[PDB]
Paper text:
Cell surface layers (S-layers) form symmetrical lattices on many bacterial and archaeal cells, playing essential roles such as facilitating cell adhesion, evading the immune system, and protecting against environmental stress. The S-layer is built from one or more (glyco)-protein subunits, S-layer proteins (SLPs), that self-assemble into a highly flexible and dynamic lattice through an entropy-driven process, allowing for structural adaptation in response to changing environmental conditions.
The SymProFold prediction of S-layers from P. abyssi, M. voltae, T. camini, T. thioreducens, and M. vannielii, even though different in sequence, size, and domain structure, show an analog domain arrangement as the crystal structure of M. acetivorans SLP and reveal a dimeric anchor, which has not been described previously.
Author numbering:
A (entry chain A), B (entry chain A): 23 to 71, 492 to 577
Write the structure that this text describes.
């Protein structure tokens, strides 16, 4: 199910005990993808030996990010994921499976982790896979 | 802003290092309320010295809950919050402020913490107040 594109295992969400990424939720999306986001945020907090960890895709841009971005939701869900799709950084449709996709430096030099699939279910599977990998 | 109804300070979300509540997200709602939910889940995870901590309001009922429920979203957002509103346990409208409302035993004997306000902003304020209180 879960396609690991890029070096996902190398994507660090914690450095010491301080989070290295925002969790960007699709504002134009289902409450499911962001249930995923909440579970991911729970995982990160668990690993947190500042600011809202979770934000909306209307409150962050790739060009202005000062840290890594975990995009939760596909192009139909997350505006930033769509921006990445409208630029060939990611190719994702309704037919796309659960996907953890690292785009290097897509956010103002900082790496991006797209956690998304074709539908809500696939996004949730990808989030769950990320949680399993973080342990 | 944040109305503390009931004994909110006494609402324990962690017992030792294992979460005592679900975080129930309004499926029929804004991605903002559940950005709140994700931030709350981050807080809980931080305090976590099993299952998805965050769920949707379509995946849990009050009558079947086996633990505390943190409802995120007002009656317009969270189906369980509406059920509580359609029963006088909570009274919440567009005019309602940011609110942390403990309903004792509303979920099959387990207590419920409504984290919600009149609009998205108020829900987020209530979530932030809960986070500050948990520390």
């Amino acid at each position: 199910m879960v396609e690991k594109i890029g070096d996902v295992e190398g994507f660090k969400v914690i450095d010491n005990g301080e989070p290295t990424a925002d969790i960007v939720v699709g504002s134009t999306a289902a409450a499911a993808d962001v249930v995923s986001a909440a579970n991911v945020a729970a995982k990160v907090g668990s690993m947190m030996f500042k600011a809202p960890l979770a934000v909306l895709d209307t409150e962050v841009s790739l060009d202005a990010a000062n840290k890594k971005l975990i995009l939760v939701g596909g192009p139909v869900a997350n505006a930033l994921t769509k921006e990445l799709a409208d630029a060939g950084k990611i190719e994702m449709t309704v037919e796309s499976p659960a996907t953890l996709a690292v785009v290097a430096g897509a956010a103002n030099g900082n790496d991006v982790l797209v956690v998304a699939g074709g539908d809500r279910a696939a996004t949730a599977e990808a989030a769950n896979a990320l949680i399993e990998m973080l342990l």
